[PDB]
Design a protein around this nucleic acid. Structure first.
Lengths: 117, 102, 109, 47, 141, 53
RNA sequence: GGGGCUCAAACCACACACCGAAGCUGCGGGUGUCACGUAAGUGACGCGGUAGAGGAGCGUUCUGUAAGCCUGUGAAGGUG
RNA sequence: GGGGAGUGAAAUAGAACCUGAAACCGUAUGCGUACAAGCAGUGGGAGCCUACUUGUUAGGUGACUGCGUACCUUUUGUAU
């Protein structure tokens, strides 16, 4: 039972080279470089499913900071005043109301100033 | 007309005709769900926000489908330590169509 | 759209694409003037291939030479020939005698 | 049927093989460790 | 999904800062804040949602303590030995706007976006600016 | 003195971004009507309205 | 670290608020072990890992199953 | 050496001839590239172009931007 391994080696290399397509030069077309680029892309993608949740939070916080300062309040005073009250409303929909629904965000910052924090 | 509802441990800005993928809530296809966990309801210049929660407001939705979205890969690799490990994931969603805001 | 091909020209492909880049998209009489006065070897070869493509269009179809435009020139690589040059201190090195495939594709668009 | 019969669960085993990949448990050394006598070929300590 | 500002439909305004006795870096931090667009709820970090800042009296800017005779500004010309320095007051005599430009430039990112934001800062020397057509209004009065 | 890395396609081709050709100095005799190089005798031996060879 | 900072953007106190991790919590999945369960069936504690131990699998070629089944209305291979 | 015509079921089975992969080299189309600094990706993301049939899609490029010093082997330890 001699078994000739050239038909499975090819499909495994096609799988790696298909995962590597779009990359520069030998990163997309030779196996020993495409393999490393695919593994590295996988590590970065694991890391960046975490940093996505880190980076969007900071953007929300920066937009809420900018929207609250137009109404005469900090970010931090706003988050404190929204817990002297009870809003349970997150950084995502507050940033969305900061850009889009500005009168509702003004109502929210006035109910935070109403709790005097 | 929009509303902020808490479905899956996270909230969604939600309007009166939208389709929305939500963490998999346990109710079969085509049935109805209510969200009595609204955080604000606004209509023009009439915006009312949650005391913690807007009392007397509910959002009605219809379950459209239970799918799984778009496999992500998990690669765990230690440099020069003979360690490599891979995993697939498809996260379940429930697509709901928002039918009423009150 | 009519081709003529030379499979195996004793010039290498890199040397022939220089002249191939120089007639692409031109009118045929303009291209024949450029090739007939060029300083190179690839232009003798590619002029003979362009003459063949034009005459194929004249005899196998009914296109006039004035209407024709050289539409697709490309030079592929042919089979190399593998020879030895003896060098110093007993050392031998490989010469490749490269060849190439010239395709001229005349058309009236 | 010859198509249908197998042995008892636990009576045959798979015969895991050393040196086939790093996600198998026995890649790159095959259970032998690192440098020294008992990782060589014929790396036996006499009785 | 969250909002992304997009560089075709970004609104920009023109502003005049009167640097007539302002502290240098405390002026520069509000200028750089407004060049990046941090004061707008449409802040997106990869697009410049900033404003154009005009600064007029940029030799009346003021450093505190002993930073007038001190506070060297350095640059190396590329040739060996070619380190070159100038203090605050000889730079505010030579090129007065370069002070309030290298302050704001150092507080912007070191990006092609930071270059694009720096292009919106127009500092000048006297009490006037050539920008009456863009109609800037005064801020931090 | 060798390379420490093989050169890519891209830099190999950027080197030879300069070695393209020209020879456009052709013109037509008014008498015979044939193309020849400027300031050169024709391939049928004419030069400025006169046979020379 | 840089810009820059001087009733500080430094230091010594004290106060209140905020940000901040793959930590915790929420929400949805998978898995190990243990205990329960006419075996649907839940709970509870887990689940970084080199050498290494242990457990369970995929695929390739051959033989039986196979004088079977598929296949020129198109096999294997190759490429999407 | 080809372009036809014929033979043949098939000649991109034409004699260097079944299939005809990858490296490597081209031509064509789309998009991006000439004020921008590094393992070349990855998270975000505008724009453009194609198919659809239009949308909270599919494919292709990816300006701009946060994070980011290959793999192995050896080692107390390597971007080294």
């Amino acid at each position: 039972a001699r078994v000739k391994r050239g038909v499975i080696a090819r499909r495994r290399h096609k799988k790696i080279l298909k995962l590597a397509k779009g990359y520069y030069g030998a990163r997309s077309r030779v196996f020993r470089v495409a393999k490393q680029a695919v593994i590295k892309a996988g590590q970065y993608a694991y890391r960046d499913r975490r940093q996505r949740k880190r980076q969007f939070r900071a953007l929300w916080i920066a937009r809420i900071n900018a929207g609250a300062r137009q109404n005469g309040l900090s970010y931090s005073r706003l988050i404190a005043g929204l817990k002297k009250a009870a809003i349970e409303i997150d950084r995502k929909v507050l940033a969305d109301l900061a850009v889009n629904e500005k009168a509702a965000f003004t109502a929210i910052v006035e109910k935070a100033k109403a709790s005097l924090a | 007309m929009y509303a902020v509802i808490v479905t899956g441990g996270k909230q969604h800005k939600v309007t009166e005709g939208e389709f929305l993928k939500v963490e998999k809530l346990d109710v079969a296809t085509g049935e109805a769900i209510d969200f009595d966990r609204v955080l604000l309801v606004a209509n023009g210049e009439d915006v009312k926000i949650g005391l913690p929660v807007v009392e007397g407001a509910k959002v009605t939705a219809e379950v459209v489908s239970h799918g799984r979205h778009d496999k992500v890969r998990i690669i765990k690799f230690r440099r020069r330590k003979h360690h490599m490990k891979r995993q697939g994931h498809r996260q379940w969603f429930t697509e709901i169509k928002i039918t009423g805001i009150q | 759209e009519v081709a003529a091909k030379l499979s195996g020209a004793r010039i290498s492909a890199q040397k022939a694409r220089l002249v191939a880049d120089q007639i692409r998209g031109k009118k045929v009489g303009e291209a024949l003037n450029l090739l007939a006065f060029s300083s190179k070897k690839a232009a003798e070869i590619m002029k003979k291939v362009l003459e063949s493509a034009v005459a194929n269009a004249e005899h196998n179809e009914g296109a006039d030479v004035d209407d024709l435009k050289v539409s697709t020139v490309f030079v592929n690589e042919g089979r190399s020939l593998k020879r030895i040059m003896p060098r110093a201190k007993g050392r031998a090195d490989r010469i490749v005698k490269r060849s190439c495939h010239i395709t001229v594709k005349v058309a009236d668009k | 049927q010859l198509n249908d019969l197998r042995s008892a669960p636990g009576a045959r085993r798979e015969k895991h093989r050393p040196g086939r990949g790093i996600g198998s448990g026995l890649g790159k050394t095959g259970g032998r460790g690192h440098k020294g006598l008992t990782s060589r070929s014929g790396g036996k300590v006499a009785p | 999904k969250t909002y992304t500002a997009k560089p075709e439909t970004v609104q920009r305004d023109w502003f005049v800062v009167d640097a007539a006795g302002q502290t240098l870096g405390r002026l520069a931090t509000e200028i750089a804040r407004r060049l990046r667009g941090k004061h707008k709820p449409e802040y997106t970090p990869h697009v410049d949602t900033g404003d154009y800042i005009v600064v007029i009296n940029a030799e009346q800017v003021r450093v505190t303590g002993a930073k007038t005779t001190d506070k060297m500004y350095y640059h190396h010309s590329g040739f060996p030995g070619g380190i070159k320095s100038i203090n605050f007051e000889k730079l505010i005599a030579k090129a007065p706007e370069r002070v309030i430009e290298t302050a704001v430039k150092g507080m912007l990112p070191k990006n092609p976006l930071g270059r694009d934001m720096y292009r919106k800062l127009k500092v000048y020397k006297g009490a006037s600016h050539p920008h009456t057509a863009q109609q800037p209004q005064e801020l931090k009065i | 003195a060798v390379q420490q890395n093989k050169k890519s396609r891209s830099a190999r081709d950027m080197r030879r971004s300069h070695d393209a050709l020209e020879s456009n100095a052709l013109s037509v005799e008014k008498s015979t009507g044939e193309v020849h190089l400027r300031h050169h005798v024709s391939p049928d031996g004419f030069y400025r309205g006169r046979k020379v060879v």
